[PDB]
């Protein structure tokens, strides 16, 4: 039961997870279709922006370009979600067969194993409306503990945190479409009760 098979650090993955978002902003704002910096390579030059200025460029982003960004985040979460679910297949969980007729039985899979694998802990609560709408909860979403809010400007800080939520949107969308189809699935906020984010699915 206790498998001690090879491993790396959590911190470098968590910070790579965090810099997937300005990677997406950099790949959209620089599509190369015809203040910044400059670097020296051998007979070669690159020109970069830094991350927090690019999140501030998301604060000054166009509205249609903002949703053009957010498709890419759920696309990359979708890819890593379906491939990570495909590796979970090796685990041989006995809950499910295919097409998820009993939808909460694989909600008892994702909270038990997938969120344990990505974020080191279970999803602490799940509430069930029986029309397919299921109410996620976790008190502390793991890759936003390191995001420091500024001094008394939390209305900007909400707007600069919640575009980091499209990656687990991609995770749960990818593990659903590894098991057959696409249905609607959104985010929430759910201000926590004792000293983070909630999710809806069909």
């Amino acid at each position: 039961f206790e498998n001690s098979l090879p491993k790396v650090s959590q911190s470098v993955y968590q910070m790579l997870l965090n810099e997937m978002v300005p990677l997406a902003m950099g790949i959209e704002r620089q599509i190369s279709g015809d203040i910044k910096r400059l670097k020296i390579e051998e007979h070669h030059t690159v020109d970069i922006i830094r991350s927090h200025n690019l999140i501030h460029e998301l604060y000054k982003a166009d509205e249609e370009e903002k949703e053009k960004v957010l498709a890419r985040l759920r696309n990359i979460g979708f890819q890593i979600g379906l491939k990570l679910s495909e590796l979970l297949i090796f685990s041989n969980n006995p809950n499910l067969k295919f097409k998820e007729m009993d939808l909460l039985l694989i909600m008892k899979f994702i909270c038990r194993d997938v969120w344990k694998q990505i974020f080191g802990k279970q999803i602490d609560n799940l509430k069930t409306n029986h029309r397919g709408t299921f109410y996620l909860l976790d008190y502390d979403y793991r890759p936003i503990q390191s995001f420091s809010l500024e001094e008394d400007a939390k209305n900007e800080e909400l707007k600069m945190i919640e575009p980091f939520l499209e990656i687990p949107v991609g995770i749960i969308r990818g593990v659903l479409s590894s098991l057959g189809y696409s249905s609607e699935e959104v985010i929430c906020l759910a201000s926590f009760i004792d000293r983070g984010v909630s999710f809806h699915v069909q």
Binding site: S146, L149, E150, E151, M160
Partner: protein
Amino acid sequence: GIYSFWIFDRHCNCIFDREWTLASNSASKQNEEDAKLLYGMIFSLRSITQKLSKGSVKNDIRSISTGKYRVHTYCTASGLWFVLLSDFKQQSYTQVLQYIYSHIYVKYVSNNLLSPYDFAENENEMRGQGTRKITNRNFISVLESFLAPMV
């Protein structure tokens, strides 16, 4: 005893400063009083420490004691300085300052993407006098959570 607390920079600007006895924590009447001359003192005594060094490894300064007060200091390898002032009642605070570096500055400033890493916003006036922002919601709260039980 923690009368004051200051953070310096690779580009030699005071970027954070805290004053004890419920004194201002912001970085603006306390600005440039003791900030440049304290850098001159730490830089000068570090420079004569690095000039008179024997062995393979160069040494760095730990503490400076006056009659009134005592100064504890800590450097990184990247060029960022933790300094603190006490009143001789306790021994060296390098464990405390390295706990600050290992548990507060990296957790809420450096790995915090949302605020910049210590730098000058591409200024040619990065030689000095660049006022900066290491203010956050939670950084000052956990810092005063740690520091205020000792007095």
